[PDB]
Amino acid sequence: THRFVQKVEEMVQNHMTYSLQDVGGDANWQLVVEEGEMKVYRREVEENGIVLDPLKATHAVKGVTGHEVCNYFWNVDVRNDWETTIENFHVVETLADNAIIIYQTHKRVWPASQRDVLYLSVIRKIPALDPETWIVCNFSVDHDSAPLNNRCVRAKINVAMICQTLVSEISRDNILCKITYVANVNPGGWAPASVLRAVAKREYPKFLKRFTSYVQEKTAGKPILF
Numbered sequence: 001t002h003r004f005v006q007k008v009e010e011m012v013q014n015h016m017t018y019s020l021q022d023v024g025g026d027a028n029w030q031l032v033v034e035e036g037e038m039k040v041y042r043r044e045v046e047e048n049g050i051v052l053d054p055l056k057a058t059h060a061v062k063g064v065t066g067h068e069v070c071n072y073f074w075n076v077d078v079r080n081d082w083e084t085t086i087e088n089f090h091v092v093e094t095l096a097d098n099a100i101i102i103y104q105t106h107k108r109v110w111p112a113s114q115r116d117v118l119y120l121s122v123i124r125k126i127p128a129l130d131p132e133t134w135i136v137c138n139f140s141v142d143h144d145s146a147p148l149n150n151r152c153v154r155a156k157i158n159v160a161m162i163c164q165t166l167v168s169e170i171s172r173d174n175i176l177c178k179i180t181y182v183a184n185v186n187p188g189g190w191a192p193a194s195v196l197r198a199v200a201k202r203e204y205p206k207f208l209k210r211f212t213s214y215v216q217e218k219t220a221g222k223p224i225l226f
């Protein structure tokens with residue numbers, strides 16, 4: 001029990017309720033990029049001239065479990081192995097064995113100002129109660145030990161990586177991880193709409209391919225962690 005436990009539970013339950021829903025039959029979501037089972041959608045949303053476009057993607061990744069996908073997404077010690085858009089990050093606070101608060105700065109995308117972010121990152125298993133599900137939620141929080149960074153505008157995020165595992169002695173050949181990934185990012189102040197939209201459209205599919213291939217590579221030949 002840390003001070004965020006109730007907020008974590010609300011965020012995780014909202015994602016389980018609303019984020020997991022299939023959007024294939026929902027014309028409100030625009031399917032923007034498809035590469036096999038990887039499907040990336042957005043809604044075009046602006047608030048006060050600032051792009052907020054919600055992002056939602058699904059993927060089906062052979063040979064890894066939801067638990068493993070979530071561990072590698074959450075574990076800061078492997079972060080620099082797959083992340084390509086981060087300049088710096090610092091763990092600000094350790095709340096629990098499954099929850100931390102992170103500060104990070106993103107590489108600048110000309111001509112917009114650099115952004116930074118301050119967020120809680122939590123990894124949770126949700127029992128079947130139906131598949132079991134593993135979820136990582138990353139969502140912005142306020143913290144006193146946030147640095148002064150005069151180069152950066154503070155973005156706010158609510159991201160979840162939600163994973164369900166299907167299985168046919170069990171082999172990697174017989175396992176598939178189904179991922180739903182959602183990201184709602186407020187860039188904080190102004191940035192050109194065309195730039196934000198092009199960064200999203202490029203960087204989200206690149207991340208999902210890169211990150212899922214990395215998990216496949218790191219786990220192959222290791223005992224399966226369900």
Ligand SMILES: CCCc1ccc(-c2ccc(S(=O)(=O)CCO)cc2)cc1[C@H]1C[C@H]1c1ccccn1
Nearest residue numbers: 085106115138155157159185187199200203204207
């Ligand atoms: C001007 C920057 C806006 C901007 C700030 C931040 C983020 C962002 C933050 C966190 C996460 S994550 O999945 O929680 C993994 C931990 O980092 C992904 C994305 C995305 C954008 C928008 C631009 C989109 C984007 C997508 C992917 C990578 C970088 N940028």
